[PDB]
Amino acid sequence: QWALEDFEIGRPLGKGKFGNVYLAREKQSKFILALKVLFKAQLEKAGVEHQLRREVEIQSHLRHPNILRLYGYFHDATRVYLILEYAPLGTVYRELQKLSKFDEQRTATYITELANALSYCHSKRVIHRDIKPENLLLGSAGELKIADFGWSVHAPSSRRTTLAGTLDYLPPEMIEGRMHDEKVDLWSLGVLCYEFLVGKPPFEANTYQETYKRISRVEFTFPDFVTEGARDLISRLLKHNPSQRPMLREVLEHPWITANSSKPS
Ligand SMILES: Nc1ncnc2c1ncn2[C@@H]1O[C@H](COP(=O)(O)OP(=O)(O)O)[C@@H](O)[C@H]1O
Ligand SMILES: COc1ccccc1C1CCN(C(=O)C2CCC2)CC1
Ligand SMILES: [Mg+2]
Ligand SMILES: [Mg+2]
Numbered sequence: 206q207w208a209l210e211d212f213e214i215g216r217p218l219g220k221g222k223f224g225n226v227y228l229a230r231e232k233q234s235k236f237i238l239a240l241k242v243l244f245k246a247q248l249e250k251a252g253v254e255h256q257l258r259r260e261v262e263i264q265s266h267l268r269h270p271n272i273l274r275l276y277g278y279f280h281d282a283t284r285v286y287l288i289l290e291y292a293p294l295g296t297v298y299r300e301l302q303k304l305s306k307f308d309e310q311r312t313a314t315y316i317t318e319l320a321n322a323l324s325y326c327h328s329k330r331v332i333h334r335d336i337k338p339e340n341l342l343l344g345s346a347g348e349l350k351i352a353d354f355g356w357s358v359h360a361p362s363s364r365r366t367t368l369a370g371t372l373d374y375l376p377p378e379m380i381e382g383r384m385h386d387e388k389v390d391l392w393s394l395g396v397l398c399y400e401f402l403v404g405k406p407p408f409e410a411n412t413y414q415e416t417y418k419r420i421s422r423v424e425f426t427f428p429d430f431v432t433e434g435a436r437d438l439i440s441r442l443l444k445h446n447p448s449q450r451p452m453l454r455e456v457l458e459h460p461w462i463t464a465n466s467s468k469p470s
Pocket of ligand 2: 245249257258261285
């Protein structure tokens, strides 16, 4: 169906490990979108064809305002191209670099939007497993959208692919290569809430080895300015034991969230 000829390409929107993403416009309709470019040689070398297929299958069938749309794909002997919804206000990651810290209203609103999208995902036993600021994008009204479903699976699951970069958002069961389910995304949710309010992730360290130790022991502390409500929610999500982490409805109905969010469930 679609091929490269059907699009005029524009400015680079960002870069990932495999992803090189560009603004583009379809020639006959003038529809504006984002083109995620992947190099076949690099995909084959790392052996992640299965992740690519998963990304397309899962993201094209999900429909939710807080989840980024994937419309289709094509390829041409050097490259694979994913056709995505364009997010005009950028990543949450860039916004955090701009402001250093978010206030409680901004943080609680993002958490609600995230929890709504994840509740929709989990109702199909889809778990994302790679929730972090560079994979959260912003729509034209500043609403959060989850993206990058390349690491997603159906629960329960083991891990067959090598962990690449940072350990900062991953739970103990995940880094220890044990068995895991939906509760992994709730741990990541707790890491995010902390990083939004403080400006850095709770287990951050100078080395891989020390970061691993701080995660498996759940060693974090709060600066003075973090309020009691925020501490309560965060302490509930960052539990070593998966089964002790709350349900998403409990997050959406937490008093600190309801007192500070500007959006509903
Ligand atoms: N639909 C989009 N709209 C705007 N920017 C995007 C979009 N998709 C990706 N980006 C930018 O490109 C980066 C990499 O995209 P991603 O799909 O996360 O690639 P990877 O799979 O390599 O992580 C993102 O962190 C973001 O900066
Ligand atoms: C249903 O197959 C796909 C769904 C989404 C994306 C890609 C595919 C196919 C399988 C992957 N591939 C390739 O050339 C591989 C990637 C290294 C060569 C393109 C065709
Ligand atoms: Mg990514
Ligand atoms: Mg990816």
